Structures are given as structure tokens and as C-alpha cells.
Design a protein around this nucleic acid. Structure first.
Ligand SMILES: [Mg+2]
Ligand SMILES: [Mg+2]
Ligand SMILES: [Mg+2]
Lengths: 249, 255
DNA sequence: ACGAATTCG
DNA sequence: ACGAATTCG
């Protein structure tokens, strides 16, 4: 059976046009009706909005104050079994690792998200956090399918410094042949929200998975959130990623 | 005076004398020159010299010939004791990507019956410019290796280096030694820039670094004898000659 | 949440 | 000529 999710850093720390941009995020979610949504940079009033607007999803959060991650699980498609939060002891930005154990498509999943330490200056801590994520991905039983989707803030060289992805962990964008149309998820030439008067682009938002051979097969990957809202800005400074996969029992 | 017994020795001071701080500069220059008068080094390597400072050196260090790394702005200089050092030529090597007018100054001399290439630089400043500083260090080390095998090469200057940056470079080449390391990393002269002990910059924090370093290319032919700090006395104005301490080094040239 | 510049302690 | 924090482009 086919499943879909979106992962999206929705820039709740930008207070400008935030109500309109939150409505814009959810209009995108309504269009694609994903089974799972992974969000980063949620803030408390944004979470309160989602609890009403997305009342058809079970909402799991990474914290209750500041800014944090969330995982939304479509009721009637996804059975919620537990949540786990793993700290990043040396974060300076309240980052952590949020996991949920669920049933979806007839199989058990561990679904994970994080907003890894931001900016070039904090590369070393970001690498330590990536190692924590990768270590946690190895802990689930082999019959459980593990998906991480989140804002990694990664540069390719940092993954190399980490040792590269393990032999049994795959990046969905790489798996699909490194398609150019959805490569960059943060692009200051195409996205004006931060008003950065220069052109930089990065593949900060990434999807990793661990599954028994042939039991999880990515089928599509697309950017979402590409349309300006009435205020002339985008829902976020990031594009979202929409991924569909076949879950084979 | 430098008699027969010490004819095998080269002594020198290297010092970033902070000519970019105009406040109290004439008095601070007199403080530097008082140090030069006390130790009478054969050679002085200076960084952050400015044109007015050259005039102060001509007045209060008149026994030294001045070779400069540029004519305007701020620049390095090598001072040669008249009657001891024979000047043979001056070479300047550019750092094409510097944003701070930095370069490599080489002065070829004869002293004590030996040929020397004496080099100084003020490598790119601040943690943010690490990449360019490492590129400049590679230029310096390459030039040290290129000199004729008969010549004795000494670099002394303000490197702005952090230890981790020399490791990123791959370490000093096999025939190039750091004088402080050679002498066993003595604690008394380890830090040459120290905002707890020196308040010239008025930084309200305590940080210390070994920015000022001496490299030499040598087998057993060049033996460091001593390394000591200078410039640790406050002057009449209540400030030091510079935000850096200077380094006083003696080396023996051996058969 | 970019790199470069600047301020503050 | 420090590092952190903030601001500029
Ligand atoms: Mg952000
Ligand atoms: Mg297909
Ligand atoms: Mg200086």
C-alpha cells in the first residue's frame, strides 16, 4: 500500500505574517492529505492552532515551550502506540530527537524527527547529534521500519566526517537518483522570506530510512510550499518535502 | 658588547608593536627602543609598523638599518644592527588573497661569518580568517624550504596561529622547527598575547595565545639557546609598549 | 538561517 | 585583536 508524509520546517520563529503563513501551511497539507507530517520550529500558539485545524491528526510534540518539533499522525490510517524523546545533552538551541512508534500500512514503524543544531559555527555539535540519530535508527527490531525526516542543517562534508550513512541506512533523495527538481530545500534566490540579499542554497531537509530489503520503497519526492501567499511571502523560508513510499509486507 | 666568545651567536627580538594604536604611540615606541638598547639584539623583527614609527626608530634605535615590508598603511620591518650584519638583499613575497595587506618579507644577510635568510610576516588576523591564515603559513613554510641549502633560514613573526590550525596544515615540515618547542615548551614564555596580564586593548575578558612564533630550518647546525619575553613593564602612561609581548631569542650557529 | 561586519563585555 | 551577540548586506 502507498503512504505519504511531509516534513517541513515552518519557521514559527518568524513572527511576521505568521497567522497567514500557518493557514498557508495547512492549505498545503489539505491538498496532499499526508498520512504523517513532521514539523520543525513549531511554537505554542502555532501548536494550539494545529490542534484545532488538524484535529483529524494525533499531534505529538517535542516540547511545550520555546520552539520545537511535532509529528502529526492521520487518525484512521496511523495507530499511535508510544512516543519517545531523546535529549541532545550539549544543544544550545533546545534541540532533541522525537520518535513515535506506530502501525501504518500493516507494518510497525518508528518515525523520527529533529531540528539539528543550526548554522555553520555549530557544525561539531550538529555532527554529534547526527550520530545520536543514526545510533537510534539502529535500535529498532529488524522487522520495524525506521523513517527519520527533519531539518538536519547538514552539509555533505559533515556526513562524510560522520563516517557516511551506515550500510543499512538510506537517504530517500539519493535512493531516487538525486533528482534536481527537489534537491535544494532552503534557497535564498527563490525564497525571499529572510530578506537575505544574496543567493545560497542547501539540502538541509533530509529523509533517512532503515528497512528490511524491499519492504520500504520510495516512489516520489517533491517540494511543497512553493507558492506565495496573499502577503507576498511564502509559508516558510524552507520548502517542505512530500514523499510517497510503498510499504511491502 | 658582543665579544669573541659570542661570535657564534645570533640574538634577535620579534615583536608586534601595535602601531595601529595611535594612543601614546611615541612613548610606547620609546619603550620598545629602551628594550632594544638593553639587549642590543643583532636583528629585530617588527609587525604593525607605520610610517611615523619608522621615524621614532630612526631617532631612538639609530644603530639599526630599517628594511620595511611596505611604504604606507601598516607593515612589517626587519632591523639590522650596523657593524654586525651585512645587508645583501631584500625580497618581498605577496599574499595574493590577503584582505589586510599582509605579505612575507625576507632579508638576506651575512652575520658572524654565515649567510642567513631572515623572514617575517604578520599572518591574517582573527579566528574568522583561519583559512587564509593557513594558506599564508603554507607560503611561508614553502619559502623556508626553497632557500639554498647552505643558507640558514629563520622566520620570526606574528603568526596569529592556534595549535589546531598547524595540525590542519599537517604540522611543521621535517626540517623546520619551532624554537619554543625545541626548548621544551617552557611555561614562562608560552603566551605572547594575554588580555588578563595586558590591558592595552581594554578587552574585559581573559584570553591568551601563542601568536608570536619562531621557525628555523636546520642538522644540528642551528641550536636555540634561550627564549624569553620582553615588554612586560608598564610605561609612564600606565600602558604597555604593545598589546603583545615580544620574544627575545638567542641561537648558536654550529659546525 | 547565508557570510561579513560590527558592537559589547 | 578575545568570543558572544547583534546587525548589515
Ligand atoms: Mg529557521
Ligand atoms: Mg516509481
Ligand atoms: Mg594587532
Amino acid at each position: 500500500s502507498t503512504i505519504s508524509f511531509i516534513t517541513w520546517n515552518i519557521d514559527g520563529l518568524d513572527g511576521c505574517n505568521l497567522p497567514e503563513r500557518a493557514r498557508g501551511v495547512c492549505s498545503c497539507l489539505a491538498l496532499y492529505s499526508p498520512d504523517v507530517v513532521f514539523l520543525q520550529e513549531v511554537i505554542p500558539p502555532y501548536c494550539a492552532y494545529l490542534k484545532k485545524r488538524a484535529a483529524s491528526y494525533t499531534i505529538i510534540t517535542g516540547n511545550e515551550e520555546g520552539y520545537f518539533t511535532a509529528i502529526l499522525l492521520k487518525k484512521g490510517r496511523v495507530k499511535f502506540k508510544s512516543q519517545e524523546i531523546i535529549p541532545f545533552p550539549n544543544t544550545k538551541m533546545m534541540r532533541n530527537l522525537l520518535c513515535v512508534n506506530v502501525s501504518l500500512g500493516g507494518n510497525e514503524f518508528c518515525l523520527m524527527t529533529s531540528h539539528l543544531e543550526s548554522t555553520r559555527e555549530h557544525s561539531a555539535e550538529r555532527i554529534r547529534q547526527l550520530k545520536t540519530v543514526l545510533g537510534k535508527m539502529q535500535e529498532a527490531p529488524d522487522s520495524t521500519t525506521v523513517i527519520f525526516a527533519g531539518d538536519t542543517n547538514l552539509r555533505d562534508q559533515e556526513v562524510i566526517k560522520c563516517g557516511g550513512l551506515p550500510d543499512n541506512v538510506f537517504d530517500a533523495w539519493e535512493f531516487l537518483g538525486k533528482p534536481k527538481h527537489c534537491q535544494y530545500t532552503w534557497d535564498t534566490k527563490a525564497n525571499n522570506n529572510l530578506r537575505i540579499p544574496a543567493a545560497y542554497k542547501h539540502r538541509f531537509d533530509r529523509i533517512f530510512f532503515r528497512a528490511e530489503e524491499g519492504h520500504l520503497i520510495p516512489q516520489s519526492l517533491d517540494l511543497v510550499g512553493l507558492e506565495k501567499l496573499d502577503c507576498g511571502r511564502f509559508p516558510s523560508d524552507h520548502w517542505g518535502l512530500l514523499c510517497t513510499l510503498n510499504v511491502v509486507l
